[PDB]
Write a protein that binds this ligand. Structure first.
Ligand SMILES: CC1(C)CC(=O)c2ccc(O)cc2O1
Length: 282
């Protein structure tokens, strides 16, 4: 079926939970043996969210190459994304090592450091120009260059230096600050505006490594971001935009990381975002 009318048909019939459970039943199951080794327990935020072995990002280290991060490679859309968990106190240095080694230009952050009164990720970037951060385990230095605070999101310019080689690179930090503590946003308008700002920066384009996107577990809000982007890109590329099947795209992405889209409300919100976004593109 088309998307907008399939949408109203699920709303009128109140069957979002049943649609979402079908997705969960059909989703791929692949081994995640490296993630479950005992030496990696403090590298994982949640025991039930692990990268598949076949698609995990490897750190360029011989001691321990493990990080909770996955490469989602979308072949028809010609887009790649790295989805990861919010960094932990003992993985902030691994996170920036990955950004460096994969040649990423942008980092997309969809959560706040504290939500619901609990810490959802580490404070992994510097908050003042004159107070830079050094990560001694991976030999990197990170400096805040500039910051632009808007009503729904903040963009930061950062400098990452590889202290071994003295090479430097500019990283863009795109921080969506207004996702509600419970539920999903009422309108997709500010999320779409944010996605378009990431696009305009060059961070999603083939001349750079894959963008790094995260929330707390790296599957819920993060899945919404890449699902919406890929679906809109396919509607631009194909002769028949109504052929784009958002459930089939989600199942393709779930071949690369488990659990993408965590609730039936997130699924409905993804439909809403693609529907509204397709009208603005034209
Ligand atoms: C963060 C800053 C002040 C400087 C910068 O490089 C930049 C890049 C992208 C953007 O959307 C806004 C920006 O303003």
């Amino acid at each position: 079926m088309e998307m907008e009318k399939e949408f109203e048909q699920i709303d009128k019939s109140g069957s979002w939970a049943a649609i979402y459970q079908d997705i969960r039943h059909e989703a791929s199951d692949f081994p995640s043996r490296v993630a479950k080794l005992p030496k990696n327990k403090n590298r994982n935020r949640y025991r039930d969210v692990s990268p598949f072995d076949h698609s995990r990002i490897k750190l360029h280290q011989e001691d321990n190459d493990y990080i909770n991060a996955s490469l989602i490679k979308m072949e028809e859309a010609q887009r790649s994304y790295i989805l990861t968990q919010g960094p932990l106190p003992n993985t902030v240095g691994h996170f920036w090592e990955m950004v460096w080694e994969q040649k990423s230009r942008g980092v997309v952050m969809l959560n706040r450091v504290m939500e619901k009164g609990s810490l959802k990720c580490a404070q992994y970037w510097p908050q003042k120009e004159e107070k830079e951060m050094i990560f001694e385990d991976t030999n990197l230095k990170l400096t805040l260059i500039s910051e632009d605070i808007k009503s729904y999101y903040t963009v930061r310019q950062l400098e990452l230096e590889n202290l071994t080689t003295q090479e430097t690179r500019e990283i863009l930090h795109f921080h969506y600050t207004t996702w509600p503590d419970f539920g999903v946003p009422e309108s997709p308008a500010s999320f779409l505006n944010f996605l378009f700002k990431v696009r305009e920066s060059g961070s999603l384009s083939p001349e750079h490594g894959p963008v790094v996107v995260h929330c707390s577990a790296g599957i819920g809000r993060s899945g919404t971001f890449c699902l919406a982007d890929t679906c809109l890109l396919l509607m631009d590329k194909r002769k028949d935009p109504s052929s784009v099947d958002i459930k089939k795209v989600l199942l393709e992405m779930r071949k690369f990381r488990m659990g993408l889209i965590q609730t039936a409300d997130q699924l409905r919100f993804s439909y809403l975002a693609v529907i509204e976004g397709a009208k603005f593109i034209m």
